[PDB]
Amino acid sequence: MRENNTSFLVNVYDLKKFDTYAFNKVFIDDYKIFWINKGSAKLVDKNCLVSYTITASSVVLLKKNSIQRFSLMSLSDESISVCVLTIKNKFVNSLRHYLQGDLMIRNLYNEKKDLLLWNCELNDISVLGEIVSTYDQTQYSEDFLKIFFSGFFSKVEKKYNSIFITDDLDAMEKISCLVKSDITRNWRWADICGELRTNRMILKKELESRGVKFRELINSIRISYSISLMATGEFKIKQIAYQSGFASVSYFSTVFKSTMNVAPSEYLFMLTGVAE
Ligand SMILES: CCCCCC/C=C/CCCCCCCC(=O)O
Numbered sequence: 001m002r003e004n005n006t007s008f009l010v011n012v013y014d015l016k017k018f019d020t021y022a023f024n025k026v027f028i029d030d031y032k033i034f035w036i037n038k039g040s041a042k043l044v045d046k047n048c049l050v051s052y053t054i055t056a057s058s059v060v061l062l063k064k065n066s067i068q069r070f071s072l073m074s075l076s077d078e079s080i081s082v083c084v085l086t087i088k089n090k091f092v093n094s095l096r097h098y099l100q101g102d103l104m105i106r107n108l109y110n111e112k113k114d115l116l117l118w119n120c121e122l123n124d125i126s127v128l129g130e131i132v133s134t135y136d137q138t139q140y141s142e143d144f145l146k147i148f149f150s151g152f153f154s155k156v157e158k159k160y161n162s163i164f165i166t167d168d169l170d171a172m173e174k175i176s177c178l179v180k181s182d183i184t185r186n187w188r189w190a191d192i193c194g195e196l197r198t199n200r201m202i203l204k205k206e207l208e209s210r211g212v213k214f215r216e217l218i219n220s221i222r223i224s225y226s227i228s229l230m231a232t233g234e235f236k237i238k239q240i241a242y243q244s245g246f247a248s249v250s251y252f253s254t255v256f257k258s259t260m261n262v263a264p265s266e267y268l269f270m271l272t273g274v275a276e
Contacts, residue, residue: 002136004135005135005136006088006090007087007088007090007091007142007145008085008086008087008088008091008131009085009086009088009231010083010084010085010086010131010132010135011083011084011085011086011231011271012081012082012083012084012270012271012273013081013082013084013270013271014079014081014082014270015036015041015072015074015079015080015081015082016074016079017074017076017077017078017079017080018073018074018075019073019074020071020072020073020074021071021072021073021082021261022071022261023068023069023070023071023259023260023261024069024258024259024261025067025068025069025212025216025220025259026067026068026069026220026223026224026259026260027065027066027067027068027176027217027220027221027223027224028062028063028064028065028066028067028068028114028224029064029176029180029221029224029225029228030064030086030087030088030089030092031061031062031063031064031086031087031092031164031165032061032062032084032085032086032087033059033060033061033062033084033085033087033128034059034060034062034082034083034084034085035054035056035058035059035060035082035083035128036054036055036056036058036080036081036082036083037056037080037081037082037083038056038076038078038080038081039055039056039074039075039076039077039078039080040053040054040055040075040076041053041054041072041073041074041075041076041080042071042072042073042075043060043070043071043072044070044071044072044073045069045070045115046069046070046071047068047069047070047114047115048113048115052117053075054117057119057120057125058117058118058119058120059117059118059120059124059128060115060116060117060118061115061116061117061118061153061156061164062114062115063113063114063115063116063164063166064092064166064173065166065170065172065173065176066114066115066210067114067210067211067212067217067220068114068115070115083132085128085131085132087149091142091145091146091149092165093168094146095146095149095150095153095165096165096167096168098146098147098150099150099154103154106157106163108161109157109161109162109163110161110162110163111162111163111166112162113160113162116156116159116160116162116164118152118155118156118159124152127140127148131145153165171196171198171202171203171205171206172206172210174196174198175192175196175203175206175217176221178192178195178196179192179218179221180221180225183221183222183225183243183244183245184242184243184244184245185245187218188214189203189214218245219255219259220259222244222245222246222255223244223255223256223259223260225244225245226240226241226243226244226246226252226256226264227260227267229243229244230267230268230271231271235268235272237249237252237253237264237265237268240252240264241253241264252264
């Protein structure tokens, strides 16, 4: 018995036929890419006001520290499956310093797109399916994966004239890291502005661009924290609520249902395959 994957995490959700997932102000804690196994689905981004049709050759990229508002509805007469690959921070910082040379046009890209669509060529279909096939690959050295992912993200960015992988100087990254370092603390806007030794304009623009008040942002971060806790194997709802910084199981359940459109136990089952 050896270790689990330190660069990625792979998560699992069963989309029953014609069902609709609705995400309202969900905080993306790490760079994510997801795709469906078969059939097709209607993906409605309520941020950029755009509806797409995604197939098994599509991948959706979700930018770290974004606040997503979108829906996913199966269009096929089949029970389809959504696989979510999360790329952890160490791997992302490896990617940031991997591409040889200066990309002269990247200095002119914009950061305004948080949800990017890429219709895969056969090579990328292969590589991604092999990454998520098992819990190890080992046929795939992490250096091969660094090269692959740096190239893939560059391709997507060029497709959209936008920055996917930001630097770590980003103000939203600082806010998120600070909140997550003490998730149970009763943070207030002034505390974060003071500890981040940054004025309230620089920081409040991060809230306005994502369309969230401060309390909404704290709640979204805590919901994503609770989901990460459920990833780690913690399954007691009371512990999940308290460790994520919520005052009560009832308030945590209310916020979780408002954000993910399912109760914490329902998400638990969709992730676990194990009902009570
Ligand atoms: C929170 C990101 C959801 C984007 C994935 C598309 C839909 C997936 C099915 C519902 C899963 C919601 C929790 C996903 C969290 C994760 O696996 O990283």
